[PDB]
RNA sequence: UCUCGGCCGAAGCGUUUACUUUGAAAAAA
RNA sequence: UGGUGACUCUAGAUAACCUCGGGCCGAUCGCACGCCGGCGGCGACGACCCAUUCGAACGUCUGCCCUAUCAACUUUCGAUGGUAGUCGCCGUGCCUACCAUGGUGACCACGGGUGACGGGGAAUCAGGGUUCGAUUCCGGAGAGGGAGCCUGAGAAACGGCUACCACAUCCAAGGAAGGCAGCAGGCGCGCAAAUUACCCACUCCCGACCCGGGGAGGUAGUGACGAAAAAUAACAAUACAGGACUCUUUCGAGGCCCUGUAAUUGGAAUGAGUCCACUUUAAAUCCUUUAACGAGGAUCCAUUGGAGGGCAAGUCUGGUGCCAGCAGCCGCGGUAAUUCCAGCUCCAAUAGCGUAUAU
RNA sequence: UACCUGGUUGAUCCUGCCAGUAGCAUAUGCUUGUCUCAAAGAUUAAGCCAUGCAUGUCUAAGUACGCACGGCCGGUACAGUGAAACUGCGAAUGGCUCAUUAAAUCAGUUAUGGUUCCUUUGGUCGCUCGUACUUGGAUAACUGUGGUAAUUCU
């Protein structure tokens, strides 16, 4: 191929996106943004697949056209924009607020928060650098530079952000013990308090997480994402806390909830 | 590049001897007592079956407290169950290679049609399906090889519109009253 | 009486200016409703008016027994002639689409691609 | 753990592979 | 200052340079308007530079078919390495100059072949395996065959250009214009493969764009590639034989006992089909739905193979007479042929079945 | 379902292959009522192509002096739609095909601390000590004259 690719393919597509097969050929190839390709949902996908305000792209482009969406405080009137995790999403028009956080099996759960929590996002600083006449400037997830950052934050730590302002609040260390959630393998979605940090140098550092309920699993570095200090997470959590289910669990929940359906 | 979908699936076996006298004279047997239209329909029930043994076959030969084994075989047994196929309380892998293509034949909608008091014979029954006089539950079911599943068994009824459940004249009844 | 119409699903979706959602007509012994019989039925229900509300996609269940479609209700025929599908209007009388064919444009384009200034306005 | 060790206060290869077991990472269809 | 496992990293300070082929430091556009000449809010567009996204390009480790009737290969015209440079977006024999003589090989190098694009995967399969993968997803490559370029961020682009080769089109013979391995369609090749259709309504993509375009795609047409479901009848009373808890001398009867040439007799049931109205959908169609008509030889008429064995089903009848033919194999046919040609009968699958070939 | 059967002999037991047997994929013959899904010029010729279409694009926000229309009425800087043209962007995506190609492509793995990066997103953008109440020249479109048999030539 010469220069970029336009398009994405259906089956190419992300599976954590939910799209299914017959629908047709194509599927929103993200625009390029602040979140990577396949760890990010479409604008599209959330406002047709998710939360069914549209039918097709043409409603889509309607909603987004008449400026009733904000990610992360700003409008943005492109369908295919990918907005990623921690990022929120504000419809003043229905007045409602979502933060786009992984359900336990690893794909966006729609998930609405606060108008008060909606100020703020938490980012996880990607990395540090001291640049022209001294100044450190920092970069997080969100693909944001934040200059003159706190001397005490690092890489690995996660911020919390003012929406409206851009600027730092408060920030959270990466020590064992803090909450964390998993942003991206087998343990993708996950919630538990950090254990341990073995280090590969050279390689990549293998991070042990522990849940509520005591499973413990295991992460490289780059897909940790601290959440809280302690256990107390600093952002609202889905309906699951974070915790998977095995699937025996999983059938034994359906089966008592059919047991008492209506 | 296409929307469509190819994943299709052959749903029998023909037999690996042609011309046996026993495995004959068993499908005709079969195609006698459940009014079968042909051969085939022995060989998809017979498919069904060995695919189900399998299955049954690969589980058992997992540990007992295998997760795998666990969720897989229960899920097999529950559905076995609700088809009717499976006592209540076989619900164990070993009774599931003790069943035999009689136990999946018999819950046809063919057989349940027949054998509930709705029809003289069991081609009387296939031809009431086929032609829209039965109905399950609420839905008018018109294919005879409809498998009714324990609880689907009694809701059974002669529809709402065939004229022996709907009360109106069919064709030939209503042309001969028309001259009378 | 013997049409009747329940909406299963419902969200007022303010982003578009109508309420969608799916219709299910029980008619058990009557041809598939016509679009407009279920449009009136429909602004009897919900106390509008029959102008603002589309209805499509209606499929009869195998039997006879139910229609199921999709139906919107729109706060005003403006925002319906904003929001609604040209080809939704069009069959409400709302819209009229081009009387050429899609060969006759591509060959007029074709043949303006030709010339140049003001005389690719004088093409047939 | 060896610079001894955060309610009595940490060894978790401080001589190597194969093998075995585990974990991570690994498109969808 | 900060960071990495690790820098000749980032940052800071010096002493200078700064390409007319500057390298940045806005002479741009819209909307709404408020104070004492000035001050301003919300945007759009643009511009270095750093991140980010999308990538691209290059390297690492491990892993591809058959061939020795291919055993030595590379090293003149870079072959392996070192030094310096050139070029390049950068690492590099990528290319030079000088130096060293190295580098690969039975653990199969090098050469040849491939009806070889690779993979995810497909067929088959007890456990192993064998074979396939042009083909809708990923990666690669190409646009008749080579080569060279322009623009740009990205192309060695071909629905861009330049030239040569092979074809080919128009010409007033001076010149000019080409590239369907895009969608249709045509010729040719062959055993072998569809419409010169409708639409951007869906899925997405592109653009200055809520508005335009898209043979990408969708929808129809041809379609026994293949796959799923699935009609071609069901019931009853009768002439008949058949069958049974009973006694009987063979009947009676068994009809919530059951078979059949029954082209008997009946009423029911219904969809194949033709027409309606919807529904579907950009218009259509097709299903689905509602009507009307529509079955007794229910003529609304099921076929393809076979009947010696293997292997299911006739050494019945007529004809032929080692002929014509059947026969995958064994064999049949030479005047009573179970084997050919036909009639009848049967049986295997059944809207499917036979044959050829590959596996 | 982890299977065999016929054929060398006067007869037997073997080795052994031939033939049978069941899928599968192409072709082909006969036949064909319903309905759903669905492949389809790959194999030989990456052979040759008539014709038509397949890539274009404007917002309130680059340039409006085409009366082509046209207003609240006028001696009105530009009312407003607005073809054309200049400008910007895209045309390097998609689609097709499998001829090349044998550690080459490709797959898993890892690196770029050895590079480039439109676009999006965030940051930076009076950090420079030396007509601005806005500079200059064109060139389209438009008018007008032409050449050529001939073209999206000019």
Same mark, same amino acid.
């Given at each position: 191929?010469?220069?970029?690719?336009?398009?994405?393919?259906?089956?190419?597509?992300?599976?954590?996106?939910?799209?299914?097969?017959?629908?047709?050929?194509?599927?929103?190839?993200?625009?390029?943004?602040?979140?990577?390709?396949?760890?990010?949902?479409?604008?599209?996908?959330?406002?047709?697949?998710?939360?069914? +305000?549209?039918? &097709?792209? /043409?409603?889509?482009?309607?909603?987004?056209?008449? !400026?009733?969406?904000?990610?992360?405080?700003?409008?943005?009137?492109?369908?295919?924009?990918?907005?990623?995790?921690?990022?929120?999403?504000?419809? /003043?028009?229905?007045?409602?607020?979502?933060?786009?956080?992984?359900?336990?099996?690893?794909?966006?759960?729609?998930?609405?928060?606060?108008?008060?929590?909606?100020? +703020?996002?938490?980012?996880?600083?990607?990395?540090?650098? %001291? $640049?022209?006449?001294?100044?450190?400037?920092?970069?997080?997830?969100?693909?944001?530079?934040?200059? +003159?950052?706190?001397?005490?934050?690092?890489?690995? /730590?996660?911020?919390?952000?003012?929406?409206?302002?851009?600027?730092?609040?408060?920030?959270?260390?990466?020590?064992?013990?803090?909450?964390?959630?998993?942003? $991206? $393998?087998?343990?993708?979605?996950?919630?538990?308090?950090?254990?341990?940090?073995?280090?590969?140098?050279?390689?990549?550092?293998?991070?042990?997480?522990?849940?509520?309920?005591?499973?413990?699993?295991?992460?490289?570095?780059?897909?940790?994402?601290?959440?809280?200090?302690?256990?107390?997470?600093?952002?609202?959590?889905?309906?699951?806390?974070?915790? !998977?289910?095995?699937?025996?669990?999983?059938?034994?929940?359906?089966?008592?909830?059919?047991?008492?359906?209506? | 590049?296409?929307?469509?979908?190819?994943?299709?699936?052959?749903?029998?076996?023909?037999?690996?001897?042609?011309?046996?006298?026993?495995?004959?004279?068993?499908?005709?047997?079969?195609?006698?007592?459940?009014?079968?239209?042909?051969?085939?329909?022995?060989?998809?029930?017979?498919?069904?079956?060995?695919?189900?043994?399998?299955?049954?076959?690969?589980?058992?030969?997992?540990?007992?407290?295998?997760?795998?084994?666990?969720?897989?075989?229960?899920?097999?047994?529950?559905?076995?169950?609700?088809?009717?196929?499976?006592?209540?309380?076989?619900?164990?892998?070993?009774?599931?290679?003790?069943?035999?293509?009689?136990?999946?034949?018999?819950?046809?909608?063919?057989?349940?049609?027949?054998?509930?008091?709705?029809?003289?014979?069991?081609?009387?029954?296939?031809?009431?399906?086929?032609?829209?006089?039965?109905?399950?539950?609420?839905?008018?079911?018109?294919?005879?090889?409809?498998? %009714?599943?324990?609880?689907?068994?009694?809701?059974?009824?002669?529809?709402?519109?065939?004229?022996?459940?709907?009360?109106?004249?069919?064709?030939?009844?209503?042309?001969?009253?028309?001259?009378? | 009486?013997? *049409?009747?119409?329940?909406?299963?699903?419902?969200?007022?979706?303010?982003?578009?200016?109508?309420?969608?959602?799916?219709? /299910?007509?029980?008619?058990?012994?009557?041809?598939?409703?016509?679009?407009?019989?279920?449009?009136?039925?429909?602004?009897?229900?919900?106390?509008? &008016?029959?102008?603002?509300?589309?209805?499509?996609?209606?499929?009869?269940?195998?039997?006879?027994?139910?229609?199921? $479609?999709?139906?919107?209700?729109?706060?005003?025929?403006? +925002?319906?002639?904003?929001?609604?599908?040209?080809?939704?209007?069009?069959?409400?009388?709302?819209?009229?689409?081009?009387?050429?064919?899609?060969?006759?444009?591509?060959?007029?384009? @074709?043949?303006?691609?030709?010339?140049?200034?003001?005389?690719?306005? @004088? *093409?047939?």
């Amino acid at each position: 191929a010469r220069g970029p690719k336009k398009h994405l393919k259906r089956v190419a597509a992300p599976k954590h996106w939910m799209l299914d097969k017959l629908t047709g050929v194509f599927a929103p190839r993200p625009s390029t943004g602040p979140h990577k390709l396949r760890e990010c949902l479409p604008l599209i996908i959330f406002l047709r697949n998710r939360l069914k +305000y549209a039918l &097709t792209g /043409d409603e889509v482009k309607k909603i987004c056209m008449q !400026r009733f969406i904000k990610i992360d405080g700003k409008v943005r009137t492109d369908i295919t924009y990918p907005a990623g995790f921690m990022d929120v999403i504000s419809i /003043d028009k229905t007045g409602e607020n979502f933060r786009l956080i992984y359900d336990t099996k690893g794909r966006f759960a729609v998930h609405r928060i606060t108008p008060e929590e909606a100020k +703020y996002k938490l980012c996880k600083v990607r990395k540090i650098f %001291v $640049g022209t006449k001294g100044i450190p400037h920092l970069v997080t997830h969100d693909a944001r530079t934040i200059r +003159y950052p706190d001397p005490l934050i690092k890489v690995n /730590d996660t911020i919390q952000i003012d929406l409206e302002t851009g600027k730092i609040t408060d920030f959270i260390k990466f020590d064992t013990g803090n909450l964390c959630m998993v942003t $991206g $393998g087998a343990n993708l979605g996950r919630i538990g308090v950090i254990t341990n940090r073995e280090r590969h140098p050279g390689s990549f550092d293998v991070v042990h997480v522990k849940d509520a309920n005591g499973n413990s699993f295991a992460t490289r570095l780059s897909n940790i994402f601290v959440i809280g200090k302690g256990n107390k997470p600093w952002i609202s959590l889905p309906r699951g806390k974070g915790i !998977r289910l095995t699937i025996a669990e999983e059938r034994d929940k359906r089966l008592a909830a059919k047991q008492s359906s209506g | 590049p296409v929307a469509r979908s190819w994943v299709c699936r052959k749903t029998y076996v023909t037999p690996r001897r042609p011309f046996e006298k026993s495995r004959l004279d068993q499908e005709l047997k079969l195609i006698g007592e459940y009014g079968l239209r042909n051969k085939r329909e022995v060989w998809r029930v017979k498919f069904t079956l060995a695919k189900i043994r399998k299955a049954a076959r690969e589980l058992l030969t997992l540990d007992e407290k295998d997760p795998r084994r666990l969720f897989e075989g229960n899920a097999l047994l529950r559905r076995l169950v609700r088809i009717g196929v499976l006592d209540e309380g076989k619900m164990k892998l070993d009774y599931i290679l003790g069943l035999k293509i009689e136990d999946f034949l018999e819950r046809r909608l063919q057989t349940q049609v027949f054998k509930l008091g709705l029809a003289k014979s069991i081609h009387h029954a296939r031809v009431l399906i086929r032609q829209r006089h039965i109905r399950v539950r609420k839905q008018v079911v018109n294919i005879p090889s409809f498998i %009714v599943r324990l609880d689907s068994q009694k809701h059974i009824d002669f529809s709402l519109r065939s004229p022996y459940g709907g009360g109106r004249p069919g064709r030939v009844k209503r042309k001969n009253a028309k001259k009378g | 009486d013997t *049409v009747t119409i329940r909406t299963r699903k419902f969200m007022t979706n303010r982003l578009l200016q109508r309420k969608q959602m799916v219709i /299910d007509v029980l008619h058990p012994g009557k041809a598939t409703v016509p679009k407009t019989e279920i449009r009136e039925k429909l602004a009897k229900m919900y106390k509008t &008016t029959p102008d603002v509300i589309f209805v499509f996609g209606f499929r009869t269940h195998f039997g006879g027994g139910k229609t199921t $479609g999709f139906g919107m209700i729109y706060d005003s025929l403006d +925002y319906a002639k904003k929001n609604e599908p040209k080809h939704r209007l069009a069959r409400h009388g709302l819209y009229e689409k081009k009387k050429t064919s899609r060969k006759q444009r591509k060959e007029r384009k @074709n043949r303006m691609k030709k010339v140049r200034g003001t005389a690719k306005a @004088n *093409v047939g």
